[PDB]
Design a protein around this ligand. Structure first.
Ligand SMILES: *[C@@H](C)C1=C(C)C(=O)N/C1=C\c1[nH]c(/C=C2N=C(/C=C3\NC(=O)C(CC)=C3C)C(C)=C\2CCC(=O)O)c(CCC(=O)O)c1C
Length: 179
């Protein structure tokens, strides 16, 4: 995915302001994956959070402006994202792909999601999600999410790695904007 990644990084750096960087990033990732939504979501201080930027295809509701107050992320102060672990779900009704030592554990069955988590995803029209941390330095800033809304979609580990590198670029841009 390095060629795809290099293309994404090129587009990101061809604009100046952070808002253009966010919009270009969500657009380029959505096009690359051929999916229906990519979002940038910013954590509040309590690890609730709000949708900041999105790219959508297929006539879905706009999520920007809206919040997601996830009680699990609040109680665990960001959950697995503090360790920069991704959350990878082909099908929200079947569960997550286990990620260990920076790759899929193909020996483990998928782990079903808790029903209120599933219901929250349904409220955002999501049927499949690959979610990775955006770090500003070593500070967990938010999440970059790739979504499919109309159907499940299989995520492979090269796509998850790409998403994490794109989130790295976002984090560097956020860090440099805060500088
Ligand atoms: C019921 C307690 C409940 C409500 C209501 C709710 O909104 N969430 C609830 C429970 C719950 N959530 C999780 C774990 C995660 N929630 C995540 C949320 C996001 N995904 C995104 O793409 C975005 C940005 C738009 C989110 C804010 C994520 C990524 C979760 C996994 C985190 C982790 O593993 O550490 C859980 C635990 C997992 C589960 O059992 O389903 C629960 C119980």
């Amino acid at each position: 995915m390095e060629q795809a990644l290099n293309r994404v990084i090129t587009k990101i750096r061809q604009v100046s302001d952070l808002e253009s960087i966010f919009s270009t990033t969500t657009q380029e990732v959505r096009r690359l994956f051929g999916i229906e939504r990519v979002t940038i979501y910013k954590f509040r201080e309590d690890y609730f959070g709000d949708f900041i930027t999105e790219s959508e295809a297929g006539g879905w509701r706009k999520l920007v402006g809206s919040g997601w107050e996830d009680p699990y992320l609040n109680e665990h102060q960001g959950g697995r994202f503090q360790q920069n672990q991704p959350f990878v779900v082909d099908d929200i009704y079947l569960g997550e792909t286990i990620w260990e030592e920076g790759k899929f554990n193909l020996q483990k069955p998928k782990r079903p999601l808790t029903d209120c988590h599933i219901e929250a995803l349904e409220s955002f029209e999501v049927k499949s999600c690959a979610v990775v941390a955006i770090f500003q330095g070593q500070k967990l800033w938010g999440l970059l999410s790739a979504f499919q809304n109309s159907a499940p979609r299989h995520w492979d580990e090269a796509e998850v790695q790409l998403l994490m590198r794109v989130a790295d670029q976002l984090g560097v841009a956020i860090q440099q904007a805060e500088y």
